[PDB]
């Protein structure tokens, strides 16, 4: 059984953050939500689709209908910034959603700069090949990266970092695509596509 959330939700202080969680007939299951800050244990904020544990601010609320469970944070504050995970059961099995990073905006939004490098000659000699996609100067610190060989999506051999702060308070990340020298020559083009706050930008390199 599969539970999927959006990767990122961004919100200004005071605005309302809405986090969804989808699953087949999720409405027939009881949904829970957990809040997790970096380096800390998860904290239950909503159980049984809408019940709120004592100690949890009432600006947190939940709902669950049809295929969708929604966690709602009204009047979001900075302390609400965290990863949120939905949770349900499948027989005796517990299932978690993919998780949603909630950013509460604390500086202007900033679109990423993207630089894509092809495999070097020196590496192609050693019978190896790596594409290097470098992503810098973005905020919020949440990105999704998609690789494509010509026009087809690639998922194998992809390794991507978690975003981290630069010395200018924006974020950086990088993604690596591992290939054989043959795979590299076998296509006309390779692309790195970086999605950030609804915008997707692409860089492209070719074996030529």
């Amino acid at each position: 059984y599969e539970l999927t959330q959006p990767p990122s939700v961004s919100v200004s202080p005071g605005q309302t953050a809405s986090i969804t969680c989808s699953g087949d007939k999720l409405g027939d299951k009881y949904a829970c939500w957990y809040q997790q800050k970096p380096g800390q244990s998860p904290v239950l904020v909503i159980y049984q689709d809408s019940k709120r544990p004592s100690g949890i601010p009432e600006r947190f609320s939940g709902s669950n209908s049809g295929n969708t469970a929604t966690l709602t944070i009204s009047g979001t504050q900075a302390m609400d910034e965290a990863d949120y995970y939905c949770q349900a059961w499948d027989s005796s099995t517990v299932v978690f959603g993919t998780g949603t990073k909630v950013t509460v905006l604390g500086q202007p939004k900033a679109a990423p700069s993207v630089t894509l490098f092809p495999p070097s000659s020196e590496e192609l000699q050693a019978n190896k090949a790596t594409l290097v996609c470098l992503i810098s100067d973005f905020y919020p610190g949440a990105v999704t990266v998609a690789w494509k060989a010509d026009s087809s999506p690639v998922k194998a051999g992809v390794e991507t970092t978690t975003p981290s702060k630069q010395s200018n308070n924006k974020y950086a990340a990088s993604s690596y695509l591992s290939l054989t020298p043959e795979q590299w020559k076998s296509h006309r083009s390779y692309s790195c596509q970086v999605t950030h706050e609804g915008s997707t930008v692409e860089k492209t390199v070719a074996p030529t």
């Binding site: 159980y47 544990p53 978690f96 998780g99 490098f117």
Partner: protein, 223 residues
Amino acid sequence: QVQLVESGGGVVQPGTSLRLSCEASGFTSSAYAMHWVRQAPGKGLEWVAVITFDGGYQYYADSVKGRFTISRDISRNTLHLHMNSLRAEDTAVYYCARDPLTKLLPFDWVSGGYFDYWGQGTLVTVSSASTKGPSVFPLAPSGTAALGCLVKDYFPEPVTVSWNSGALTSGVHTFPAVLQSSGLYSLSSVVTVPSSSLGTQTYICNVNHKPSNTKVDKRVEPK
């Protein structure tokens, strides 16, 4: 107060066995269904196993069944996760979690259960990675140009990069390393420079990996 304290984590080789412990306090674990949940670095939560308050029933995620066994030391109010035949993708922080609703299993009715208490977690690193110096490759530049150095497959952290021994600093960005599934790190350093200077100016990246006593210079040039 209620508390959970997990233990037994560490860095180990693939195929090896390891036993995690979670000691309860402020309550009796024999009155609750108790769970193990794990989280790979930078990834999401993944449920691993449950044992009933009775101890008479256990259940497991497919990814660990036949390899992991959950159990309870009633005398010492302690739960255990015995992991055999460990694999690289078992690398995670392992959390002990308490479930107040679940009693007998399988469920008679639909589960409204949840985790009200979590431990702090114990880290389990499964890797055969050992000390290894990086391969260093130039990233050739294509009114500016970006050029750099790829620092490939090293262990452990850290690697440091400079350019012309630290004489060139403007426009230098050295990225945080990626930790690949192999347990080896890679990083890149880039510098943006004038396109017109590519013919006269020399750009050399200096890569240092102290654990392997590796100091490598690589000249980076067009074409």
